[PDB]
Design an enzyme around this catalytic site. Structure first.
Site, PDB file in Angstrom:
ATOM      1  N   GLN A  57       0.839  -1.178   0.000  1.00  0.00           N
ATOM      2  CA  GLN A  57       0.000   0.000   0.000  1.00  0.00           C
ATOM      3  C   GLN A  57       0.881   1.237   0.000  1.00  0.00           C
ATOM      4  OE1 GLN A  57      -2.838  -1.462   3.177  1.00  0.00           O
ATOM      5  NE2 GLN A  57      -4.073   0.192   2.270  1.00  0.00           N
TER       6      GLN A  57
HETATM    7  N1  LIG Z   1      -6.531 -14.075 -11.019  1.00  0.00           N
HETATM    8  C1  LIG Z   1      -5.429 -13.969 -10.267  1.00  0.00           C
HETATM    9  N2  LIG Z   1      -5.498 -13.461  -8.988  1.00  0.00           N
HETATM   10  C2  LIG Z   1      -4.389 -13.378  -8.217  1.00  0.00           C
HETATM   11  C3  LIG Z   1      -3.134 -13.779  -8.709  1.00  0.00           C
HETATM   12  N3  LIG Z   1      -2.218 -13.559  -7.710  1.00  0.00           N
HETATM   13  C4  LIG Z   1      -2.855 -13.041  -6.640  1.00  0.00           C
HETATM   14  N4  LIG Z   1      -4.192 -12.926  -6.934  1.00  0.00           N
HETATM   15  C5  LIG Z   1      -5.247 -12.407  -6.053  1.00  0.00           C
HETATM   16  O1  LIG Z   1      -5.056 -11.024  -5.820  1.00  0.00           O
HETATM   17  C6  LIG Z   1      -5.418 -10.707  -4.489  1.00  0.00           C
HETATM   18  C7  LIG Z   1      -4.342  -9.877  -3.784  1.00  0.00           C
HETATM   19  O2  LIG Z   1      -3.102 -10.521  -3.779  1.00  0.00           O
HETATM   20  P1  LIG Z   1      -2.060 -10.405  -2.553  1.00  0.00           P
HETATM   21  O3  LIG Z   1      -1.184 -11.599  -2.620  1.00  0.00           O
HETATM   22  O4  LIG Z   1      -2.745 -10.314  -1.231  1.00  0.00           O
HETATM   23  O5  LIG Z   1      -1.292  -9.045  -2.971  1.00  0.00           O
HETATM   24  P2  LIG Z   1      -0.082  -8.299  -2.198  1.00  0.00           P
HETATM   25  O6  LIG Z   1       1.033  -8.054  -3.144  1.00  0.00           O
HETATM   26  O7  LIG Z   1       0.346  -9.013  -0.983  1.00  0.00           O
HETATM   27  O8  LIG Z   1      -0.787  -6.918  -1.836  1.00  0.00           O
HETATM   28  P3  LIG Z   1      -0.432  -6.108  -0.508  1.00  0.00           P
HETATM   29  O9  LIG Z   1      -0.509  -6.975   0.752  1.00  0.00           O
HETATM   30  O10 LIG Z   1       1.012  -5.634  -0.714  1.00  0.00           O
HETATM   31  S1  LIG Z   1      -1.519  -4.766  -0.359  1.00  0.00           S
HETATM   32  C8  LIG Z   1      -5.735 -12.004  -3.763  1.00  0.00           C
HETATM   33  O11 LIG Z   1      -7.132 -12.102  -3.630  1.00  0.00           O
HETATM   34  C9  LIG Z   1      -5.197 -13.077  -4.688  1.00  0.00           C
HETATM   35  O12 LIG Z   1      -5.949 -14.266  -4.655  1.00  0.00           O
HETATM   36  C10 LIG Z   1      -3.044 -14.296 -10.026  1.00  0.00           C
HETATM   37  O13 LIG Z   1      -1.976 -14.675 -10.536  1.00  0.00           O
HETATM   38  N5  LIG Z   1      -4.207 -14.378 -10.775  1.00  0.00           N
END
Ligand SMILES: Nc1nc2c(ncn2[C@@H]2O[C@H](COP(=O)(O)OP(=O)(O)OP(O)(O)=S)[C@@H](O)[C@H]2O)c(=O)[nH]1
Ligand SMILES: [Mg+2]
Length: 164
Positions: A57
């Site tokens: 974020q």
């Molecule tokens: N369709 C799809 N969805 C994905 C993929 N990778 C992650 N997601 C979805 O995106 C959402 C957010 O991913 P997340 O892993 O929590 O991001 P993050 O990088 O940790 O985000 P933050 O914590 O820095 S804010 C989750 O609901 C996850 O299931 C992907 O390769 N394909």
């Protein structure tokens, strides 16, 4: 087994946390926007990756600095379906790698969410992230899908392979 400290950064919702637990637990877990950090040690190809998962974020990006010192490899995760913020990802990426603290880090890009109808192909991400315009520095753009696992191990492999 040799050890390798990996720092994992990217914009909010890029999929960093998901990559972490898919690699570690082998399942696709339920996540929430990461506020502090997560840590898992993943052992693959006789190497112990020490992977640090940090919230993406905007208000908490200033915290990334705290984790630089030590990092042998950066994993930068991109939502490839997020065309509105690719430029922003470029910024943050470059901020990371230019910080004296990361001068010698290997750079793995996860072009993530490739399963999604608008995948904004790997070659695209590479040009769009201003990587081409980077020599004398070890970088690769790995395509992945964090939910399925595709590319994940293949990325780990590259870090194994590209670490002297
Ligand atoms: N369709 C799809 N969805 C994905 C993929 N990778 C992650 N997601 C979805 O995106 C959402 C957010 O991913 P997340 O892993 O929590 O991001 P993050 O990088 O940790 O985000 P933050 O914590 O820095 S804010 C989750 O609901 C996850 O299931 C992907 O390769 N394909
Ligand atoms: Mg997270």
């Amino acid at each position: 087994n040799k050890e390798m400290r990996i720092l994992m950064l990217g914009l909010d919702a890029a999929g960093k946390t998901t990559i972490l637990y898919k690699l570690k637990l082998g399942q696709s877990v339920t996540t929430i926007p990461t506020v502090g950090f997560n840590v898992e040690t993943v052992t693959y190809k006789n190497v112990k990756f020490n992977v640090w998962d940090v919230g993406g974020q905007d208000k908490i990006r200033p915290l990334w600095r705290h984790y630089y010192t030590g990092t042998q490899g950066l994993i930068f995760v991109v939502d490839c379906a997020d065309r509105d913020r690719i430029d922003e990802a470029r910024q943050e990426l470059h901020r990371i790698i230019n910080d004296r603290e990361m001068r010698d880090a290997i750079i793995l890009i996860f072009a993530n969410k490739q399963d999604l109808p608008d995948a904004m192909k790997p070659h695209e991400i590479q040009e769009k992230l201003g990587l081409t315009r980077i020599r004398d520095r070890n970088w690769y753009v790995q395509p992945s899908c964090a939910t399925s696992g595709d590319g994940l191990y293949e990325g780990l492999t590259w870090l194994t392979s590209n670490y002297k």
